[PDB]
Each structure stands twice: as structure tokens, then as C-alpha cells.
Amino acid sequence: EFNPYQKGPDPTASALERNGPFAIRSTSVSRTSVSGFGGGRLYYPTASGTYGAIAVSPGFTGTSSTMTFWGERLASHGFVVLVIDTITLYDQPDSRARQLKAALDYLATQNGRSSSPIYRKVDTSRRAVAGHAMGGGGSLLAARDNPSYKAAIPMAPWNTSSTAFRTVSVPTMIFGCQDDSIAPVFSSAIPIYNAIPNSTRKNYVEIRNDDHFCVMNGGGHDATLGKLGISWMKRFVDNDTRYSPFVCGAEYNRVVSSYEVSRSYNNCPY
Numbered sequence: 435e436f437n438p439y440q441k442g443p444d445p446t447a448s449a450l451e452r453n454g455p456f457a458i459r460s461t462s463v464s465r466t467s468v469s470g471f472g473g474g475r476l477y478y479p480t481a482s483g484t485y486g487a488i489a490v491s492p493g494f495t496g497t498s499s500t501m502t503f504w505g506e507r508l509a510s511h512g513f514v515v516l517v518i519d520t521i522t523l524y525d526q527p528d529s530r531a532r533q534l535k536a537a538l539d540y541l542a543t544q545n546g547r548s549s550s551p552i553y554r555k556v557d558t559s560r561r562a563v564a565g566h567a568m569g570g571g572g573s574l575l576a577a578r579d580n581p582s583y584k585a586a587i588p589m590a591p592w593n594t595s596s597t598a599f600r601t602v603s604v605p606t607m608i609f610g611c612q613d614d615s616i617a618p619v620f621s622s623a624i625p626i627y628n629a630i631p632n633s634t635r636k637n638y639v640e641i642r643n644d645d646h647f648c649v650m651n652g653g654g655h656d657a658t659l660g661k662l663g664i665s666w667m668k669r670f671v672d673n674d675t676r677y678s679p680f681v682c683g684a685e686y687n688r689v690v691s692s693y694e695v696s697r698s699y700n701n702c703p704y
């Protein structure tokens with residue numbers, strides 16, 4: 435099927451386990467130069483063309499410096515990625531959802547500014563969210579409230595009641611940390627997964643024998659979580675069905691049946 439959003443080589447496991455084939459630059463977004471979020475860190479490919487836009491939120495008392503992995507790893511596979519700082523360290527999930535929307539609106543603005551390093555670099559119609567803990571809840575609430583979004587990746591989601599997510603229509607991949615002692619997977623992440631309609635493309639992958647920061651910088655799951663996140667963004671932000679096997683096929687089965695993973699659920703195939 436013709437796909438104008440397809441970029442980069444045919445994917446193989448080893449390639450998706452490391453920084454991608456797009457050379458990237460990063461720049462700081464000053465809190466003072468934006469409204470509706472606390473600024474953050476911008477990653478973009480230096481090669482020409484338009485790329486999907488992704489906004490990533492930290493959790494409670496979290497800063498963008500703790501998620502630079504996701505900025506670099508996603509951008510280097512061919513996305514424009516803004517890891518936000520929030521207005522306050524203490525912003526709740528609903529607030530983080532509004533800030534993720536403003537962050538994506540910010541990218542759409544900068545796309546039309548001749549001065550911006552991402553001038554003419556953003557496909558403003560192809561937007562996704564992701565986040566850690568209350569940022570994960572926030573990404574899923576932003577997906578609920580903005581059903582034009584292409585993908586959400588909540589990671590170790592925290593407080594928000596599962597009942598909030600019974601109408602989510604955005605393709606959602608959730609990461610769990612099996613021994614999360616802040617947001618226990620069986621009471622926080624898995625009920626959220628289960629609440630999403632079975633008509634929505636979804637996936638849950640849980641990291642074995644690890645706690646709440648297993649998805650964050652220094653978490654020690656770059657190869658697996660990076661591969662799954664790149665693959666989910668590629669599949670849904672870019673409509674790139676070459677990535678299906680990494681979320682539903684042979685390469686997914688090898689990962690979820692490995693010693694690194696304690697659970698997976700999905701409504702594959704897709």
C-alpha cells in the first residue's frame with residue numbers, strides 16, 4: 435500500500451536496539467519563550483523532509499533531563515521530539531495532558547517560523563504523546579481528549595483511574611516495570627490497559643524484575659524499550675506496516691518470551 439510517510443531502511447532488530455540512521459541536533463526550549471508548558475528539550479533530524487511530531491512528559495518531580503534517552507532514540511529513527519518540562523514539578527496528570535497538547539501546538543507553530551531549526555520539518559497532521567508515571571497518565575488523557583493523535587506510549591503510569599480511559603481510540607502501547615513499588619503494575623498500568631476499548635490497537639509490555647525508573651534514562655532497557663517505542667511510533671505516526679512484526683510478529687514474540695519481559699498483552703494482529 436503506497437505510504438508517503440515511510441522513512442529509513444527496512445527495520446531489523448539490531449538497528450532498532452540503537453540510535454537510528456538520522457543524524458540529529460538538539461536545542462533547549464526556554465520556559466519564557468512558550469505558553470501552556472515549562473519548555474524542554476527539542477530533538478530533530480538534520481536531513482530534509484517532514485517528520486511526525488512527538489511530545490514526551492516526565493512525572494511528578496520529573497525533569498526533561500531524565501528522559502533525553504527518548505528524545506535521542508526516537509529522533510534518530512526519524513521524528514521531531516520535544517521532551518517537556520512542566521510549569522511546576524508538582525503538576526497533576528490533567529495538567530500534564532494540557533502541557534503535552536501545548537507542546538505539540540508549539541511544534542506546529544515553530545514549523546512555520548523561518549528562524550526555527552525545525553522550519554518546514556514537521557508534519558503537523560501526525561502527532562503523538564508519551565510520558566512517565568503522571569506524565570504517562572497525562573499522555574493517555576491527551577490521547578483521549580485529542581483523538582486526531584496517531585499514538586500514545588504511557589510508561590509506568592501512576593494515579594489516574596482506569597475508568598478515565600474507556601473511550602481511548604488512539605493506538606496505545608503501555609510499558610510496565612514488574613516490581614514498580616510507586617505505581618504497581620497490577621493496580622495501575624494493567625487496569626488502564628484493560629479499560630481501553632478492544633476496538634483500539636493496544637499493547638502492554640512489562641520489564642521483569644525492575645522498578646519505577648526502568649523506562650527512564652539509565653534504566654538498562656534501551657535495546658528492548660527503544661525497539662518497541664520506535665516500532666509503535668513508526669507503525670502508527672508513520673503508518674509504516676514494516677514495523678508490525680516488532681509489535682505483533684516474530685521480533686515481538688522473541689522479546690516478550692525473553693527473560694527481560696514478565697508480561698505482555700495485545701489485540702494483535704495490526
Ligand SMILES: *[C@@H]1O[C@H](CO)[C@@H](O)[C@H](O)[C@H]1NC(C)=O
Pocket residue numbers: 632701702703
Ligand atoms: C479483541 O480483539 C482481538 C483482535 O482483534 C480479538 O482477537 C479478540 O478475540 C477480541 N476480544 C474479544 C473479547 O472479543
